[PDB]
Amino acid sequence: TKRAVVFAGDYAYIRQIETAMKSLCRHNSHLKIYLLNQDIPQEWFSQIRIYLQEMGGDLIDCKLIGSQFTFARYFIPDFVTEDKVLYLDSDLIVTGDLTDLFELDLGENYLAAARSCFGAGVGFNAGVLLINNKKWGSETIRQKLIDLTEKEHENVEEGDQSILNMLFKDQYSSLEDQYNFQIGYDYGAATFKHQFIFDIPLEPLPLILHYISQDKPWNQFSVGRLREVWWEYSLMDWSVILNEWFSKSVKYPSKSQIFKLQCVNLTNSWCVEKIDYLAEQLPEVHFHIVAYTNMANELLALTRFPNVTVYPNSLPMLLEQIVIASDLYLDLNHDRKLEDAYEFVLKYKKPMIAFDNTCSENLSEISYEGIYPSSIPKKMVAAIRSYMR
């Protein structure tokens, strides 16, 4: 059975994130990792998802694209479905079996959280949270965290960590220091002459190393201890991690599914009739959605699907190569139709289909191999599948 973990980071931190995830996975099978992000490319998710699945888990691309949306942590209950989830920062390393941490009862607590810097900071450290997702959702904790941040964000040193403290004061149980061992405090410890911090044993290795502060181990120069450990995981090939688990008979089939069809549309509108439904309904079809300008969030968010490539600011000749490379044109876009498409559809004799509300006004029913009901799009799903061999 699957244990739920969540990270949040943009593509600029993909090296840290991937590493955090590598360490985690090294020592823990059956992980359903949810990754909140905005800009991480989809080829990365396709490949890493294969590995997670092979270890009896999964990888969920949670796109924070839309006006309703770094304070990504806040949105955890909007994406995560299980009752309990572990949030983890990306500037950190997992050194062993986290069973205890996973299997811990929160009771009526909103979350479990370790103290800031071994007792030196106020409150708890936000970098490891065993979260009661059921209660975060069913108590509207997301919107509460949002509204608390509008009301006073300046009056609070330390970002969303201070806000999570300010809301959950005395409403959290507490994790031991080794499940969020803030080795990155070293520079601050040394700064404030906290001599006994350097006396804490680093053998055996703490279960979670959290390299807080600006003094990061992956930088050129770092003064903090355990710099060498981050690099062990960062430079570890995924095949090392996997062969460990395929040595101890923990091996599952992936879903590296290949496409049985290549579909394309060119749009000059945010609205592409049933594109989301068609995407989820046809995993085996790569949809190519092209534009000549910037795209609105409703389309950019299609990055969440493994099987949809989106092309903002393309050009006619690039569209043309896609049409050549395609099996089927889907005439789904609403407002102004762009002529270049019909041109290329005729030119390379490409079949075309549409919905009753997305047909061209300045065109005729022989141009379409079928016109399908936009309120019964499963009929379009069956039509599309009929072009597969």
89 binds, among a copy of itself, Mn ion, none (CB under 5 to 8 A by kind): Mn ion
**Which of 91, 104, 127, 97 is closest to 26 using CA atoms?**
97
Residue 255 interacting with a copy of itself (CB under 8 A): no
Instruction: Examine residue 244 and tell whether it contacts a copy of itself (CB under 8 A).
Output: no
Residue 320 binds a copy of itself, judged by CB under 8 A: yes
User: How is residue 281 written in tokens?
Assistant: 């309904």
Residue from the set 99, 153, 169, 223 that interacts with a copy of itself by CB under 8 A:
223
Q: How far is the CB of 72 from Mn ion (least distance, A)?
A: 13
Q: How far is the CB of 57 from a copy of itself (least distance, A)?
A: 18
CA distance linking residue 100 with residue 352, whole number of Å = 56
CB of 176 to a copy of itself, least distance (A): 23
91 lies in the binding site for a copy of itself (CB under 8 A) = no
Residue 77: name its binding partner from Mn ion, a copy of itself, none (Cβ under 5 to 8 Å by kind): none
Please return the burial class of 137, using the count of CB atoms within 10 Å of its CB with bins 0-12, 13-18 and 19+.
middle
How far is Cα 128 from Cα 87, in angstroms, rounded to an integer?
6
Name which of 299, 298, 293, 358 is nearest 329 in CA terms.
Answer: 358
Report the residue number, 127 or 188, with the smaller CB distance to Mn ion: 127
Around Cβ 138, how many Cβ atoms within 10 Å?
10
Which tokens go with 182?
Answer: 């803030």
Give the whole-angstrom CA distance, residue 186 versus residue 182.
8
Within 10 Å of residue 50's Cβ, how many Cβ atoms?
15
Note the residue count of the chain. 389
Report helix, strand or coil for 84: strand
Residue 89: closest CA among 66, 73, 101, 65: 73
Told to check if 215 binds Mn ion by CB under 5 A, we report no
Smallest separation, CB 1 to a copy of itself (Å): 28
Which one-letter DSSP state was computed for residue 206?
A: P
Q: Is 39 in the site for a copy of itself (CB under 8 A)?
A: yes
Nearer to Mn ion, 16 or 29 (CB): 16
Binds 340, which of Mn ion, a copy of itself, none (CB < 5 to 8 A, cut-off by type)?
Answer: none
How many of the other CB atoms lie within 10 Å of CB of 148? 17
Taking CB under 5 A as the criterion, which residues in 84-123 touch Mn ion? 89, 91
Q: How far is the CB of 136 from a copy of itself (least distance, A)?
A: 29
* Among the listed residues 15, 52, 19, 16, the one whose alpha carbon sits nearest the alpha carbon of residue 34: 52
195, burial (CB in 10 Å: exposed 0-12, middle 13-18, buried 19+): exposed
> Which one among 105, 150, 170, 221 touches a copy of itself, defined by CB under 8 A?
221
**One symbol per residue from 44 to 83: x for binding a copy of itself (CB under 8 A), - otherwise; what is it?**
x--x------------------------------------
Q: Compute the least distance from the CB of residue 288 to Mn ion, in Å.
A: 26
Q: Which residues bind a copy of itself (CB under 8 A)?
A: 11, 14-15, 39-41, 43-44, 47, 186-187, 189-191, 193, 195, 198, 218-221, 223-225, 227-228, 231, 235, 237-240, 303, 310-318, 320-321
Q: Which residues bind Mn ion (CB under 5 A)?
A: 89, 91, 127, 212
